[PDB]
Design a protein around this ligand. Structure first.
Ligand SMILES: *[C@@H]1O[C@H](CO)[C@@H](O[C@@H]2O[C@H](CO)[C@@H](O[C@@H]3O[C@H](CO)[C@@H](O)[C@H](O)[C@@H]3O)[C@H](O)[C@H]2NC(C)=O)[C@H](O)[C@H]1NC(C)=O
Ligand SMILES: *[C@@H]1O[C@H](CO)[C@@H](O[C@@H]2O[C@H](CO)[C@@H](O)[C@H](O)[C@H]2NC(C)=O)[C@H](O)[C@H]1NC(C)=O
Ligand SMILES: *[C@@H]1O[C@H](CO)[C@@H](O[C@@H]2O[C@H](CO)[C@@H](O)[C@H](O)[C@H]2NC(C)=O)[C@H](O)[C@H]1NC(C)=O
Ligand SMILES: *[C@@H]1O[C@H](CO)[C@@H](O[C@@H]2O[C@H](CO)[C@@H](O)[C@H](O)[C@H]2NC(C)=O)[C@H](O)[C@H]1NC(C)=O
Ligand SMILES: *[C@@H]1O[C@H](CO)[C@@H](O[C@@H]2O[C@H](CO)[C@@H](O)[C@H](O)[C@H]2NC(C)=O)[C@H](O)[C@H]1NC(C)=O
Ligand code: NAG
Ligand code: NAG
Lengths: 215, 414, 271, 49, 49
């Protein structure tokens, strides 16, 4: 679905792992632009690029799997990053297994020389914000679960988007796909400069996008 | 003498001269080498009862973990340990990306064929190590447990490709017969069988050889030796290496509240004002332990040769040259002053120390430190219907010196 | 300490720049001594410390808002307390703030002595011995100095005293309600605070080197090229220090012109 | 624009020198503001025309 | 000559920096001396004359 929607002031994560109390810090990083047009995809399972980064969201508590298939060729030619959640694990297998033309462990039908395979505790009304990026072979995932009342789209708020997990991978992700009444949003990160406001707790309680308007 | 040399002169006037600086040296360094973390399972590839053969190895592709080469190096359980161009100890410091281990059993004497450099006949058919091989090869005549299936390559014509997996067993001699005819007269199985019984000699006994070739450096780096983790030595100027953050200071206890994903504590400007130790997950406040400035108070050279020493912003206990902590030690807001006696009488300021404290040369003669007096204490007698009229005068000739011009100087730049 | 933090390898590379670091310290010491001279010149004009009269029969003039408050711990007048309230572990990289030679309690005594001398005698305590005079008679001398006869004050003493008290009372409200009331002093405070922040924030710049940390350069790289990278860092940090020192010199020359005007206004208007 | 005329590589290289251009711009803006204040101090003494 | 123009470049940079520092400090000191001389002229006109 080509429907667009406004992201408002959502999609800002912690650029680093440094505590800051009452510091208004300017960070130049791949951030989601303020009041940007993010694509709302309804059931559907389209193919979407990656470019520099990807923003993800969820609305209802249906909990329909919601894995991811970050790849670069996805035809058993290069290592592909697959994330599978089964309410007990977050299995991240980077391997060239060949996903079918319409993926939905039967996603793939092969087993190549599968590399690093981190597995840990699961992390996945209830808004579920995610940010996926890759800079120098390190796949970074940030996530935040927030409670809100569903009305029409992403709410107007700014909680924290705390970081989730960094993985040493080394591949390049040029494309990605979503695993599965589907309803989600996709935004694209851009190399912006953001002024982040830290409170006494080291929490980013406010942010300003220094490209949106003259003020 | 320090004042004389810092001024490049043999005579010094009266005043305070800043000679050198003061800094408390670090007592020790704290790294306290790291956790168990995720260990590399080398014991599985070494202590393998079902050891494979040279034609087909137990291909163990090992990934992010800490491989303790020191464990395999300080123990002489295996007969021979080799590692390419690297001492085993430093093997725990310089690290790499990923490792691949191939384990096999060979026939005794021909342990030297498998080598990155010098060639061997066995390496020409069974397995040739890469020319740019960098790994660790462990060989030992295990015998007993693995001695009582074991067939070794004997029929090939080209050296095995660097880091290749070949398990071919088709029957042929070399190329001469146009039709091999299964086993005609000499085309036996390439995997020749041998006797692996205890009666065999050292050169014909099962020799367990395991190669541990690690891939060269790429964009990531996961298989690394022991690094990270810290400890606590609080209230002491020490060098600390906290997860790669290296610096000198005092790690006092802190009441800060880090979120459970932040480690550093850079607050305002870019200085690290706090840190988190990855052993107890507590917050330590980094502070500059002590520094200041050594200033010499001297009443000139013509008048005398005695001096006093002021340390700018240090305590009188933190001062350890000659005598610097015994007697005549007075702690003022402007620092710790030694060599000067505190007098309760207040005089006009002579040598300004700071914070209302001055120093002077007075009585034999010594150096006194006092609180400067603002002036004569006049009593003001205000009274209405009362006036004061002068009945005499004085003609006072005062002086006023004013600079007007400086020396005109030209410089030939070329 | 600022350029080469506790690194002997960097400190040995700083020795070949000559007396670049012995000159910035000299300039900063001169600036500090000049600040002390400014403070002493503005306030320490008269040396006799006159005591505040313990009475209130000044002919109707109030003076309570300018004379020191004995009840409060600090001996400061309400106006001085308002002005002090309006204006708002050592640093890591060798930056220290030396304390002023004249404490705030010592300057307050100088101000109180000047006020007591003005109330007691008028202008006669700044040109010789202090000759006492009743304040209604002293104000008749100052009325006589502006072309107005003596009888104008004596026949309007109550009205003049009431106007004086009302103006002094409104001074506090005007000072405590204007947004940029003490804007000049606050700008003086802010300019130095931001200069130090910019100076210390220049230690996180590469200046063309591979990293802004000397330990990373010394460990990752071989000494021959670590020398080049450390020299680049030294050049950058020395340039930053020189910029800070020059800007502080210009700012201190600007402040010294305002301290030579406060000392002139003290002599020609307070005395 | 003076040091690196419309060149992105030169701008990226100059970004490694910290807040130098910011200091220069602040100084020049302060000079301009002082120049505007001088005329008001000299001529705008009485504000009744 | 090819390798003698890199050390000479460092010498030139250092000596130029020293000269510029000297000129700047002398300019500030000359401004202070000019202020003092203006005060001296004012005292000569107001008090001697
Ligand atoms: C000089 O002027 C000051 C004020 O500028 C006079 O002090 C004022 O004294 C009056 C009368 O005592 C105080 O008014 C009363 O104070 C208390 C507390 O509020 C209470 O009884 C009444 O509600 C009433 O307000 C006034 O607060 C006080 N002002 C200050 C600032 O302390 C002083 O008396 C004058 N000196 C003279 C007349 O000699
Ligand atoms: C890794 O990144 C490089 C740089 O973008 C990719 O290179 C080009 O990528 C496009 C789209 O992915 C390909 O169609 C081109 O053929 C690539 N150009 C060349 C000549 O390299 C590269 O493909 C990425 N890696 C993978 C395996 O996708
Ligand atoms: C976030 O800040 C709040 C408000 O300052 C913290 O709540 C206070 O916590 C401190 C100790 O950290 C207590 O002394 C206060 O009584 C608390 N106040 C209230 C109103 O609860 C809160 O702990 C911080 N969150 C953290 C540290 O995770
Ligand atoms: C590394 O090992 C240290 C101890 O050497 C572990 O510290 C533990 O911390 C807990 C509290 O978090 C203490 O109650 C335990 O006593 C400590 N363990 C031991 C064995 O003393 C630390 O958690 C380890 N870090 C890892 C495994 O990442
Ligand atoms: C005013 O003071 C002057 C001195 O400043 C007095 O003159 C002195 O008088 C004494 C006593 O006769 C002599 O011993 C001194 O030699 C005089 N000094 C000078 C400089 O001439 C003068 O008497 C005083 N006038 C009054 C009226 O008391
Ligand atoms: C020691 O230092 C502390 C903390 O700065 C200070 O309060 C105390 O007065 C000092 N004591 C002595 C004896 O110097
Ligand atoms: C100065 O006064 C203090 C405080 O009363 C007293 O202890 C000390 O002995 C006095 N010193 C001298 C030299 O009189």
């Amino acid at each position: 679905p080509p429907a667009y929607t406004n992201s408002f002031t959502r999609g800002v994560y912690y650029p680093d792992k440094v505590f800051r109390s009452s510091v208004l810090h300017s960070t130049q990083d791949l951030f989601l632009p303020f009041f940007s047009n993010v694509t709302w995809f309804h059931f559907d399972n389209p193919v979407l690029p990656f470019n520099d980064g990807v923003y993800f969201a969820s609305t209802e508590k249906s909990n329909i799997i919601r894995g991811w298939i970050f790849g670069t060729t996805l035809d058993s030619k290069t290592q592909s990053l697959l994330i599978v959640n089964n309410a007990t694990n977050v299995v991240i297998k980077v391997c060239e297994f060949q996903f079918c033309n319409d993926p939905f462990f039967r996603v793939y039908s092969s087993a190549n020389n599968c590399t690093f395979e981190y597995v840990s505790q699961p992390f996945l009304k209830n808004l579920r914000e995610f940010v996926f990026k890759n800079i120098d072979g390190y796949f970074k995932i940030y996530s935040k679960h927030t409670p809100i009342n569903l009305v029409r789209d992403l709410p107007q708020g700014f909680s924290a988007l705390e970081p989730l997990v960094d993985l040493p991978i080394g591949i390049n992700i040029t494309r990605f796909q979503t695993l599965l009444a589907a309803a989600y949003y996709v935004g694209y990160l851009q190399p912006r400069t953001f002024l982040l406001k830290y409170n006494e707790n080291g929490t980013i309680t406010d942010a300003v996008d220094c490209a949106l308007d003259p003020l | 003498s320090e004042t004389k040399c810092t001024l490049k002169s043999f005579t010094v006037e009266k005043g305070i001269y800043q000679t050198s600086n003061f800094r408390v040296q670090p007592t020790e360094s704290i790294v306290r080498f790291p956790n168990i973390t995720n260990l590399c399972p080398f014991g599985e590839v070494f202590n393998a009862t079902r050891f494979a053969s040279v034609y087909a190895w137990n291909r163990k592709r090992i990934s992010n973990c800490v491989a303790d080469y020191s464990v395999l190096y300080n123990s002489a359980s295996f007969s021979t340990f080799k590692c390419y161009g690297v001492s085993p100890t430093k093997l725990n410091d310089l690290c790499f990306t990923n490792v691949y281990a191939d384990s096999f059993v060979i026939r005794g004497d021909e342990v030297r064929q498998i080598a990155p450099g010098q060639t061997g006949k066995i390496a020409d058919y069974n397995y040739k190590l890469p020319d740019d091989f960098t790994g660790c090869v462990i060989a030992w005549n295990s015998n007993n447990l693995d001695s009582k299936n074991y067939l070794y390559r004997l029929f090939r014509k080209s050296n095995l490709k660097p880091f290749e997996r070949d398990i071919s067993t088709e029957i042929y001699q070399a190329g001469s017969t146009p039709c091999n005819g299964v086993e005609g007269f000499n085309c036996y199985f390439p995997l020749q069988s041998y006797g692996f019984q205890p009666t065999n000699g050292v050169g014909y006994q099962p020799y367990r050889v395991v190669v541990l070739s690690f891939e060269l450096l790429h964009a990531p780096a996961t298989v690394c030796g022991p690094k990270k983790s810290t400890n606590l030595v609080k209230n002491k100027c020490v060098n600390f290496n906290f997860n790669g953050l290296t610096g000198t200071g005092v790690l006092t206890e802190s009441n800060k509240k880090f979120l459970p994903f932040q480690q550093f504590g850079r607050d305002i400007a870019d200085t690290t004002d706090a840190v988190r130790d990855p052993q107890t997950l507590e917050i330590l406040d980094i502070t500059p332990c002590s520094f200041g400035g050594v200033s010499v108070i001297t009443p000139g050279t013509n008048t005398s040769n005695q001096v006093a020493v002021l340390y700018q912003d240090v305590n009188c206990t933190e001062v350890p040259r000659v005598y610097s902590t015994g007697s005549n030690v007075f702690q003022t807001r402007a620092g710790c002053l030694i060599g000067a006696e505190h007098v309760n009488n207040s005089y006009e300021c002579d040598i300004p120390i700071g914070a209302g404290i001055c120093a002077s040369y007075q009585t034999s003669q010594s150096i006194i430190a006092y609180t400067m007096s603002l002036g004569a204490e006049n009593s003001c007698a205000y009274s209405n219907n009362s006036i004061a009229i002068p009945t005499n005068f004085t003609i006072s000739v005062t002086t006023e010196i004013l600079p007007v011009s400086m020396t005109k100087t030209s410089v030939d730049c070329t | 300490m600022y350029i080469c933090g506790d690194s002997t390898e960097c400190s040995n590379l700083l020795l070949q720049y000559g007396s670049f670091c012995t000159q910035l310290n000299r300039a900063l010491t001169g600036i500090a001594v000049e600040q002390d001279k400014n403070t002493q010149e503005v306030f320490a004009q008269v040396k006799q410390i006159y005591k505040t009269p313990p009475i209130k029969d000044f002919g109707g003039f109030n003076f309570s808002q300018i004379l020191p408050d004995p009840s409060k711990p600090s001996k400061r007048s309400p106006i001085e307390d308002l002005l002090f309230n309006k204006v708002t572990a050592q640093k890591f990289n060798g930056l220290t703030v030396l304390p002023p030679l004249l404490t705030d309690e010592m300057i307050a005594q100088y101000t109180s002595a000047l006020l007591a001398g003005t109330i007691c005698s008028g202008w006669t305590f700044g040109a010789g011995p202090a000759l006492q005079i009743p304040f209604p008679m002293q104000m008749a001398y100052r009325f006589n100095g502006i072309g107005v006869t003596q009888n104008v004050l004596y026949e309007n003493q109550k009205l003049i005293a009431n106007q004086f008290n009302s103006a002094i009372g409104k001074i506090q409200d005007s000072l405590s309600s204007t947004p940029s009331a003490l804007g000049k002093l606050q700008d003086v405070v802010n300019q130095n605070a931001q200069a130090l922040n910019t100076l210390v924030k220049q230690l996180s710049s590469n200046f063309g080197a591979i990293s802004s940390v000397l330990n990373d350069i010394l460990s990752r790289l071989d000494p021959p090229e670590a020398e080049v990278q450390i020299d680049r860092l030294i050049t950058g940090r020395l340039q930053s220090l020189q910029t800070y020192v020059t800007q502080q010199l210009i700012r201190a020359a600007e402040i010294r012109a305002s301290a030579n005007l406060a000392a002139t206004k003290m002599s020609e208007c307070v005395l």
